């Protein structure tokens with residue numbers, strides 16, 4: 001459920017059971033094992049999922065005013081069609097608090113920001129809405145990564161590497177705040193990952209920007 | 218009055234008394250030079266005006282309208298009196314100013330600037346073509362078939378007296394298409410330059426009026442400096458209202474100056 005903070009406070013009786021869960025060294029695998037409803041094959045990554053389930057640490061930078069290094073957590077899943085990345089994560093859309101689900105060719109860069117047009121309520125047009133700044137700290141389950149124009153995906157460099165936005169149009173000009181973690185389900189230009197041709201080139205990306213990612217399991 | 222006669226006298230004892238250019242003042246002869254080329258657009262120096270008599274800087278803004286009128290009256294009463302030869306062609310005058318120690322950029326003028334002395338610049342944009350309006354009020358009686366006669370005209374107001382050759386009668390009437398005085402017209406739409414903006418947003422603009430002497434000089438995208446004065450249409454529909462009066466603002470040009478001005482231009486020093 002949602003994130004008001006005040007209307008979600010739990011009782012101490014539940015804290016008993018929570019710290020009970022914490023009292024398992026089995027807990028390292030329990031919740032990763034409780035990720036799927038019924039899926040019992042090679043969950044060895046679900047521990048790597050769970051570091052984003054328990055969605056990251058808050059290393060604040062109200063300390064020095066400098067260098068603003070959030071505990072940025074960024075991981076993507078990529079592979080063949082066999083894996084239920086779209087369906088797993090269609091269900092995980094029914095898990096994530098800030099559950100989004102878009103993908104390559106669902107919405108453009110401006111399909112993510114500045115939904116600007118006329119408003120007969122004011123009897124005037126207005127500067128208007130976006131997608132990501134509603135999903136702060138959240139996730140969008142995403143697939144078909146190698147599908148977008150270069151207009152998008154040079155935005156992602158900006159956010160994945162600074163987690164920021166500063167905008168300039170003829171109407172409103174903005175320096176907003178936007179920041180969150182990834183999930184995605186990228187795909188190659190191929191049908192199967194080509195044997196003896198790594199995703200170092202199989203999926204369609206550059207030379208060390210491919211290397212740039214934290215780790216895509 | 219005793220003093221309210223002395224305005225024109227100050228002009229008269231100005232234009233042939235305050236003298237510079239090493240004698241033989243301009244306004245001794247510059248007016249002659251205006252009558253020569255058949256212009257009727259004499260222009261006055263505010264600098265030189267203050268160098269003679271500072272008094273008419275404060276006696277202006279209470280009604281610069283009447284100041285300008287009471288000047289050009291003097292130009293007639295001098296011209297046709299000494300140049301009665303003039304009295305065929307145009308025989309009508311108005312004067313200009315070109316010294317105001319000020320540039321008001323746009324987005325700078327507000328309710329305090331109402332109906333008084335102004336300067337500003339901008340850039341031209343698309344506007345109307347070439348048209349005239351009227352200048353004198355006269356109609357035609359039909360009860361008695363007479364003329365209502367010519368009548369004293371207010372700037373945008375009705376007269377309707379009972380006095381007329383029809384036994385001062387004939388409330389009804391009709392109107393002719395001649396025997397009445399005309400006046401050219403043209404408009405402008407002024408924008409602000411792309412240099413002196415507030416650095417990146419949409420610009421502002423207000424409209425400006427030029428008059429019969431003043432047309433076929435401007436063009437879209439031209440360089441400019443104008444005195445002008447601040448207008449007010451006195452009612453853009455007052456009633457049970459908006460959340461706001463639908464009022465607007467214009468400037469009416471007295472003296473326009475081009476800031477390119479690519480013609481042969483300058484006056485002559487005496488030596």
Ligand SMILES: Nc1ncnc2c1ncn2[C@@H]1O[C@H](COP(=O)(O)OP(=O)(O)O)[C@@H](O)[C@H]1O
Pocket residue numbers: 039040041080081082083084085086087143185
């Ligand atoms: N463990 C699983 N549980 C349920 N369905 C599975 C599982 N593994 C594979 N599938 C099936 O495999 C298919 C995966 O296709 P999908 O992931 O949606 O293609 P893409 O990889 O392009 O997203 C799904 O239709 C899903 O039903």
